[PDB]
Amino acid sequence: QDSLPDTKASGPAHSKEVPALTAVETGATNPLAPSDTVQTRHVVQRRSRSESTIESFFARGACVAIIEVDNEQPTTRAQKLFAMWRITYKDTVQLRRKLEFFTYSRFDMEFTFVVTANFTNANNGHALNQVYQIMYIPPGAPTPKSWDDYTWQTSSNPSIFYTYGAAPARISVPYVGLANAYSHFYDGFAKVPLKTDANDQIGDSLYSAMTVDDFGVLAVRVVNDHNPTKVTSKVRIYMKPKHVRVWCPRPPRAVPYYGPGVDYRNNLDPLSEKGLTTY
Amino acid sequence: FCGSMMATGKILVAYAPPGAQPPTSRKEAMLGTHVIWDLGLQSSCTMVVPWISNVTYRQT
Amino acid sequence: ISEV
Amino acid sequence: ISEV
Amino acid sequence: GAQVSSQKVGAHENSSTINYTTINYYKDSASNAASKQDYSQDPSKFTEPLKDVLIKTAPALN
Amino acid sequence: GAQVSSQKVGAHENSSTINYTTINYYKDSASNAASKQDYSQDPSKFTEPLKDVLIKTAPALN
Amino acid sequence: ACGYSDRVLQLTLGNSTITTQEAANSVVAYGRWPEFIRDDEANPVDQPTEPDVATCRFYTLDTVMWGKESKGWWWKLPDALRDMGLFGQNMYYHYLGRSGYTVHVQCNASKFHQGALGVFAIPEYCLAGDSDKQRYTSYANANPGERGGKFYSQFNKDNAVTSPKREFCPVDYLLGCGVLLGNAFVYPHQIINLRTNNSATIVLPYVNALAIDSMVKHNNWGIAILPLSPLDFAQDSSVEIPITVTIAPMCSEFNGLRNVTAPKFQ
Amino acid sequence: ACGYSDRVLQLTLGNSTITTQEAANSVVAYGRWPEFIRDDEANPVDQPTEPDVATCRFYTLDTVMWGKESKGWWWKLPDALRDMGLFGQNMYYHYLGRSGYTVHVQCNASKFHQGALGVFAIPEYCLAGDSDKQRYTSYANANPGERGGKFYSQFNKDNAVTSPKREFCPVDYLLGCGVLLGNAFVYPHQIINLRTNNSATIVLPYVNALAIDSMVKHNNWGIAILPLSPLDFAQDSSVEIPITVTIAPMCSEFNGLRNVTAPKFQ
Ligand SMILES: Cc1cc(CCCCCCCOc2ccc(C3=NCCO3)cc2)on1
Ligand SMILES: *C(=O)CCCCCCCCCCCCC
Ligand SMILES: *C(=O)CCCCCCCCCCCCC
Incomplete structure (x- = not known):
């Protein structure tokens, strides 16, 4: 049973008890029900808050990133034969704003990968089905310089081998934070400038940034050797928090996001024009 | 200490938890976690660096 | 089994 | 079954 | 090791308590789906963080 | 023949002991997944391979 | 019984006492009183320092003036207290420190004055x-x-x-x-x-x-202190009244002792 | 049993440990270990501050050199420690303070060196x-x-x-x-x-x-440290060895908190 409270039948009043009057200076919100200020009937309440539970509010796979990777002939100028993405919920706005209703969080994370591909050029023959490698590289591990160098041997790093056309790839991740909860907001620095420092560059940090690499990166490549004709692919990453817990509520972001921190730049006018005595 | 047995000496070894100026003088080093090693028949000294951190796990 |  |  | 629970039935067919079954296949609890049977709490730590919480029929200030 | 064990639950949903189930399908134990419930031991055969192991508060050499 | 009231309070911490004859009850953030780190939530293994009465007492900050053009003031904690007596010293001689706080904001005027201050305690501001x-x-x-x-x-x-x-x-x-x-x-x-x-x-x-x-x-x-409703008095266009912030550290404990941290504030 | 000795000692106070493989047992002055002020011997009524591990730990002073012309050195307590970390701060922010001390004097040389130091602890010197x-x-x-x-x-x-x-x-x-x-x-x-x-x-x-x-x-x-017998070695007329004094405050408590005392040492 998760239903809300029944409305109580309430009659007329002529008393020294005054629930309608209060003082919001105290910091508290007046605990009033309709029966405190109007005559009410008895209602047996069946409605429920099942869908607004923290889990139910976040129980949805959100698009957090679009990684583009090519399979073509290895030439000698900059190419996308492999790609790397810094793991974050912040290249996208939607889930970011939902998570930001709270200061701290703790959860397991589900990653789902939708992979799409197409032909780039009108025609140089075709391509056989591609296998994609998605390698997790935790902070410290060697990062690839080349689409097929030794790092891809992935002996200790976790990797997904996705076959094109198969159902979207899916994995789960534990609560991997260094703290007892994830900090959606960090008012402070990773370094302090000391009076005894040589340059004053030594103690300079980014405000509100914590560890430099936070959760590491995802390195994506096409395992197949190149066809004559070029194939371009995109890996869309869907992120879902599960077994979620949250602490300290915050006002929602009201103006557009300007990078990873609380910084605003413009469209600082969220509210519309409406006349005071206009319905 | 891999010196001769006829050799004597007292050494201070220290650990300063993060956040301040890295010690350039024994005077500053004395103020943190430290062991004053006296050389003698027991050849070796052990300083334990205690887990003192803010986060539950540090990065490698 | 576990019936809840 | 075997419950451990 | 199967887990059996009642579903909260919304629209009922013209046919009482209906159940569903759940079995975890993996060792890591991170691998698990969501139970979605989530308990609720009082808003009071946010709506009434007062040292002397007062009864609504009496004066807020006295 | 099903095998049932408790998971060591890390992050808990707002809902206690949770289990998982395992069934070997093949005759050859080589075919089996890893149980990952691995016991630990003393470093002593490496950290203290001494014939007369001594107590840390007393002189190493005497 | 006797004559007690939500409006009249006495706070005493260490050698310092605050009185107020016109309070609006008092708030305990998130319904949680300040406490010390429990053995089962502990993380630095070294014996902590708890200075108690010497640091957990009322430090009064420099008074600010509220006038008709005042848009709002903000402070950060522990930063506002970094130079306050032995609290400041303890904070700078140690790598780690935790503390709760009693914040007391002071602003009196008169039955004929007007205005409203929003006083907000924000986690991670x-x-x-x-x-x-x-x-x-x-x-x-x-x-x-x-x-x-x-x-x-x-x-x-x-x-x-x-x-x-x-x-x-x-x-x-x-x-x-x-x-x-x-x-x-x-x-x-x-x-x-x-x-x-x-x-x-x-x-x-x-x-x-x-x-x-x-x-x-x-x-x-x-x-964060913002004027939710602007200061006003009689018809005098240039009214000005003081706002004084007095703060006390609570259940303060410190870990990781070594040489003093001297930040460069220039 | 096992292998223990009067000559080999470990002292641990706060985050600091001293070892010595060549001690001559150790002295407790007047047979009295340091202790805190008892309720029935108490005189200032205000709640004391006891900083414990942050002040009751081993502060090492600047090393002095002992040579053939060295006539003797002296120090006063608490004065020698007035600038030592949080002990110094506690001492200067309070009107009153009491503390006991473990004094450890250090002077090693060699089986072929010669000399004897008289180390004296004098009440009211x-x-x-x-x-x-x-x-x-x-x-x-x-x-x-x-x-x-x-x-x-x-x-x-x-x-x-x-x-x-x-x-x-x-x-x-x-x-x-x-x-x-x-x-x-x-x-x-x-x-x-x-x-x-x-x-x-x-x-x-x-x-x-x-x-x-x-x-x-x-x-x-x-x-007071005086050379009861002068330093000598082999036949070298200009021998010189170090003397290091390391001191720890013990059972330190303080009363009468207010603004910091800044003595004029010029
Ligand atoms: C800040 C902040 C960040 C978050 C979300 C943190 C999630 C951290 C996950 C870290 C690990 O991510 C992985 C992603 C994919 C894979 C993977 N392995 C095989 C291929 O995909 C492994 C780890 O919440 N707050
Ligand atoms: C408790 O689970 C005992 C009953 C098991 C009934 C048969 C389950 C069939 C599915 C087993 C999945 C094994 C996955 C590793
Ligand atoms: C012990 O295992 C008895 C219970 C079996 C429950 C049903 C299992 C269904 C899976 C059987 C797999 C057979 C594989 C060769």
Whole structure:
């Protein structure tokens, strides 16, 4: 049973008890029900808050990133034969704003990968089905310089081998934070400038940034050797928090996001024009 | 200490938890976690660096 | 089994 | 079954 | 090791308590789906963080 | 023949002991997944391979 | 019984006592009183220092003036107290420190004056900056100490790309952080509406994603005071009354002792 | 049993550990270990501050050199420690302070070196002065801090009546105070005779005519180190070995908190 409270039948009043009057200076919100200020009937309440539970509010796979990777002939100028993405919920706005209703969080994370591909050029023959490698590289591990160098041997790093056309790839991740909860907001620095420092560059940090690499990166490549004709692919990453817990509520972001921190730049006018005595 | 047995000496070894100026003088080093090693028949000294951190796990 |  |  | 629970039935067919079954296949609890049977709490730590919480029929200030 | 064990639950949903189930399908134990419930031991055969192991508060050499 | 009241309070911590004959009850943030780190939530293994009465007592900060053009003031904790007696010393001689706080905001005027102050206790109060440059506010500017900072009615972008000020630019109706001020009430708070009360009293627990952290690197709580309704008196266009903030550390403990941290505040 | 010895000691206080493989047992002055002020001997009514691990730990002073002409060195407590970390701060922010001490004197040399140091712990070590002028040694000169002072082989009277040095003139065989050094053994003491031991360890109780007093105005204990037998080695006429004094405050408590005392040491 998760239903809300029944409305109580309430009659007329002529008393020294005054629930309608209060003082919001105290910091508290007046605990009033309709029966405190109007005559009410008895209602047996069946409605429920099942869908607004923290889990139910976040129980949805959100698009957090679009990684583009090519399979073509290895030439000698900059190419996308492999790609790397810094793991974050912040290249996208939607889930970011939902998570930001709270200061701290703790959860397991589900990653789902939708992979799409197409032909780039009108025609140089075709391509056989591609296998994609998605390698997790935790902070410290060697990062690839080349689409097929030794790092891809992935002996200790976790990797997904996705076959094109198969159902979207899916994995789960534990609560991997260094703290007892994830900090959606960090008012402070990773370094302090000391009076005894040589340059004053030594103690300079980014405000509100914590560890430099936070959760590491995802390195994506096409395992197949190149066809004559070029194939371009995109890996869309869907992120879902599960077994979620949250602490300290915050006002929602009201103006557009300007990078990873609380910084605003413009469209600082969220509210519309409406006349005071206009319905 | 891999010196001769006829050799004597007292050494201070220290650990300063993060956040301040890295010690350039024994005077500053004395103020943190430290062991004053006296050389003698027991050849070796052990300083334990205690887990003192803010986060539950540090990065490698 | 576990019936809840 | 075997419950451990 | 199967887990059996009642579903909260919304629209009922013209046919009482209906159940569903759940079995975890993996060792890591991170691998698990969501139970979605989530308990609720009082808003009071946010709506009434007062040292002397007062009864609504009496004066807020006295 | 099903095998049932408790998971060591890390992050808990707002809902206690949770289990998982395992069934070997093949005759050859080589075919089996890893149980990952691995016991630990003393470093002593490496950290203290001494014939007369001594107590840390007393002189190493005497 | 006898004659007691929500409006009349005495607070005593260490050798310091506060009285108030016009309070609006008092707030305990998130319903949690300050406490010490439990053995089963403990993380640094070394024996902590608990200075008690010498640090857990009422430090009064420099008074600010509230006038008709005042847009709002802000402070960060522990930063506001970094130079306050033995609390400051303990904070700088140790790598780690945790503390709760009793915050007492003071603003009296008269039965004929008008105005309302929104006093807000914000966990992790990250503020917005100067520039096109993101997350660029410098340590020295992010931390004003006792002096605190201010809000502005609008966003003046620091244009000088050659020698940037690396300062915050806190806009009032955006709570200085990209959200709307009207919603800041989800934070622990009180209102000083001058017809009702002299003062505000908020008790803050230690709030963090960790049991303890570096007080020098990170502020746990932000105190934001904004005029929800502007000051006014009789018909005198240039009215001015004082606002005094008095703060007490509570259940303060420290880990990681070594040589003193001397931050460069220039 | 097992292998234990009078010569091998470990001392641990706070985050600091001392080891010694060549000690001559250790002394507890007057058979009294340091303790806190009991409720029935208490005199200031205000709740004391007990900083514990942050102040009751081993502060090492600047090393002095012992050579063939060295006549002796002296220090006063708490003065030697007035600038030592949080102990110094606690001492200066309070009107009252009491503390016991573990004193560890360090001087190693070699099986072929020669010499003997008399290490003495003196209650109320009043020293003699410069002049024809009685009780005239100035505060700044009476208190050298960590640096300590020295003894002299004879009394050189400060003659310049116009601009007097207002210094002590401690003569060695008179223990710097009008008595004979041979009798200083009635004081808590140890001897560092180099063929026998590296170090001396004396544990001092708080000794006074009061349960607590002003640490800034008055020193409780004096540490006097004199060469009872001169340093010598092989045939080298200019031998020199270090003497290091490491001291720990014990059961430290403080009363009368207010603004910091800043003495003028010039
Ligand atoms: C800040 C912040 C960040 C978050 C979300 C944190 C999630 C951290 C996950 C870290 C690990 O991510 C992985 C992603 C993919 C894979 C993977 N392995 C095989 C291929 O995909 C492994 C780890 O919440 N707050
Ligand atoms: C408890 O689970 C005992 C009953 C098991 C009934 C048969 C389950 C069939 C599915 C087993 C999945 C094994 C996955 C590793
Ligand atoms: C013990 O295992 C008895 C219970 C079996 C429950 C049903 C299992 C269904 C899976 C059987 C797999 C057979 C594989 C060769």
